Amino acid sequence: KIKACIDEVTTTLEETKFLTNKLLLFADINGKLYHDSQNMLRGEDMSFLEKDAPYMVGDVITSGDITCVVIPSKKAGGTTEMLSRALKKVPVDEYITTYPGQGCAGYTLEEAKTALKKCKSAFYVLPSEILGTVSWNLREMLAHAEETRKLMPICMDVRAIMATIQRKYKGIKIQEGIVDYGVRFFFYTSKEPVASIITKLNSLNEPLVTMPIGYVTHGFNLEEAARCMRSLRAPAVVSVSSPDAVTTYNGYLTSSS
């Protein structure tokens, strides 16, 4: 059940803390917390969560007032029914939590809400850059990346883009990952899932100039590409098709699923 959303308007954190001290965190099979659950921590010792890893979906781990549940991953085939069932394994109580299974190709906000509402526990739910969206063509993007020395993610499987690159940067040895030849490229495939490309770029944590990842290449429309791009944390200049798409994209990026 969802007792309240902690929007700071209607409900506040310090006031909810009178009701319960218990937190419900969401983890993956590897014992790694979902980003929203990680942002709920304030220097608590989370070492205990790796002491018993790897986990099975539905595994419940408790240390003091922190409870962690191992949830199914949507980007690996997990359904809403599987999500609700992993939540039913949590001992019935009052918890401060977030929407489970957010973001790139993860569960939608409505699916996360449903799973929390279906649960028998009472939940106090905490809620889950625009300045970077441009409308530059490939030429303009390449010129920017060569001048700034920024990393430029590029889908290796877009034939028209590869021909342009090979003609502009003659003798380029195209290979997966980092290729520093005129421009510092980051070559990725349409085979590698978007969430995986995003994790690799988030890890590399450096300035990027890119198109919205997965748009067309991985079967995403603009909205779906934007929703996945929310999970990109590395500083990025993001180029959309037309100037008309800039506002559209910003709208999808700024919304709630």
Next chain:
Amino acid sequence: CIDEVTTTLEETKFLTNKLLLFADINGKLYHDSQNMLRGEDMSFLEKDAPYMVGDVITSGDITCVVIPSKKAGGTTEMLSRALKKVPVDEYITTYPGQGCAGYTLEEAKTALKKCKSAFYVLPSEAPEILGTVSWNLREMLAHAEETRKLMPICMDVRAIMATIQRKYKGIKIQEGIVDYGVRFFFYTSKEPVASIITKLNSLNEPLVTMPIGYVTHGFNLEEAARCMRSLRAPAVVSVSSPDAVTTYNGYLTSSS
């Protein structure tokens, strides 16, 4: 649009000639689409690989569409959009994206119904001849040791590992094949079900196993059964109680 058929492929070919096959990014066909072939030259499908979701490839009367994979995050909306790229016509086809952790029958039906093309839908591979038993671990191990059958086991189930290590003292537990008293096939809860199923289908040998993914990967019995339809290697499958045998067989024999 749709006309679900009780009749065979060779029989349906009297109605129309065009086939709609479903492929992945690598240009490899989905199992149901591969079973629709009768020695046709499929080399052309590799000539232009890798593909993007939505790519349409035609040679003669065979049309292939690159569909999104549900077991990799694909949605129904993505599936319907890839299908809208297929030229409007009459096709003999199957339900797209069937398989383990693939799209459900209702999601596949919806995507085909959303499409403007007219379909003659051949049934999926699913079902009398069943080896569903209700054996406990000890019984399963005794059977595997005497028959020398391969016994898939989830390495991350602590209680199962303790039993194994106590029965087969000195066992060096490692991923994959470990031949020590029983020929085990150790897998992780990290590896997806469809991937374990593919590895076992490839090894193609007699198995004695519990329904793959049940509990370990978050599946309830119904979901584990639905994934088990994709298992083709000969298998003895053990469920909890004798009461679960019929329940499981029901889920295995059913539609979705």
